[PDB]
Amino acid sequence: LTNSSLMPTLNPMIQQLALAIAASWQSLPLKPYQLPEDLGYVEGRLEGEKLVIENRCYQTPQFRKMHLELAKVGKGLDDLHCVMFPEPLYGLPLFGCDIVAGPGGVSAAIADLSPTQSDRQLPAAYQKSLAELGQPEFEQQRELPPWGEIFSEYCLFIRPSNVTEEERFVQRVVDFLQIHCHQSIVAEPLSEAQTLEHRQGQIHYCQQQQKNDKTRRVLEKAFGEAWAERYMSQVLFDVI
Numbered sequence: 001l002t003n004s005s006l007m008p009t010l011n012p013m014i015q016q017l018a019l020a021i022a023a024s025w026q027s028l029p030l031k032p033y034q035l036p037e038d039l040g041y042v043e044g045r046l047e048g049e050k051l052v053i054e055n056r057c058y059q060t061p062q063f064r065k066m067h068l069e070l071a072k073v074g075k076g077l078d079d080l081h082c083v084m085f086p087e088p089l090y091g092l093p094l095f096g097c098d099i100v101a102g103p104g105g106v107s108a109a110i111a112d113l114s115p116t117q118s119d120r121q122l123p124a125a126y127q128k129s130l131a132e133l134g135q136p137e138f139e140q141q142r143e144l145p146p147w148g149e150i151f152s153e154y155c156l157f158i159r160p161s162n163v164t165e166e167e168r169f170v171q172r173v174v175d176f177l178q179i180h181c182h183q184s185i186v187a188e189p190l191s192e193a194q195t196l197e198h199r200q201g202q203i204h205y206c207q208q209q210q211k212n213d214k215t216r217r218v219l220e221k222a223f224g225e226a227w228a229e230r231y232m233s234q235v236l237f238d239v240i
């Protein structure tokens with residue numbers, strides 16, 4: 001991320017989370033993942049503010065697509081988006097996070113390891129490791145929208161209230177990533193029927209995430225409806 005144009009000007013929590021995600025991935029057996037049109041940086045404006053986006057995307061045998069996206073709208077909204085999309089053959093959950101900030105601080109911080117099983121449960125080893133982290137305390141919890149039924153019982157959705165909480169959230173993401181990368185070492189290829197189950201779960205996750213009209217509006221204001229639909233369905237939440 002040394003080379004990032006956006007990083008120097010992003011919200012400090014976002015910066016730390018980008019660094020933590022990059023550090024988690026850094027020594028993995030990474031290969032490039034070409035986004036549509038081999039997208040990297042993109043900017044657009046219509047009648048209002050400009051939206052700037054920086055994309056990074058990789059893959060490994062266990063992760064179909066590892067997407068880290070940074071964005072800024074004019075000087076007023078920052079976003080970090082990340083999803084690690086699993087290879088269904090290994091049945092790992094989906095790591096994701098979305099962090100939205102403005103000049104007044106972080107408004108929204110979401111992170112999860114989301115299920116892909118038909119029973120909507122995380123694998124047993126994830127349940128146990130997550131539980132052992134304890135229930136974090138956060139003073140300003142936010143209720144997920146209906147489409148957020150896709151998220152696990154361990155999902156975080158907060159407005160951080162102070163620096164202590166920002167740090168606690170970052171540390172929880174670090175802990176999620178650590179559990180996830182360890183479980184990916186001990187995962188084995190699954191049966192054809194299980195693979196199919198996990199693929200279904202990932203498809204559903206993406207279809208539900210596409211219902212987030214707050215994200216869609218940011219994209220639309222800078223690029224328009226058609227661009228935004230392409231971006232959400234082909235770049236952010238591609239349905240396998």
Ligand SMILES: C=CC1=C(C)/C(=C/c2[nH]c(/C=C3N=C(/C=C4\NC(=O)C(C)=C4C=C)C(C)=C\3CCC(=O)O)c(CCC(=O)O)c2C)NC1=O
Pocket residue numbers: 069071079080081082083095096097098100107108110111112144145148157212214215218219
């Ligand atoms: C260009 C990309 C991009 C932008 C611009 C973006 C914006 C964005 N996401 C938001 C919410 C949100 N975002 C999520 C969740 C997620 N969203 C994800 O992309 C992932 C991976 C998760 C979860 C793992 C949820 C649950 C909300 C709240 C939606 C609501 O309040 O209705 C909001 C509202 C913030 C608030 O209410 O304080 C905005 C503006 N998200 C993006 O990804």
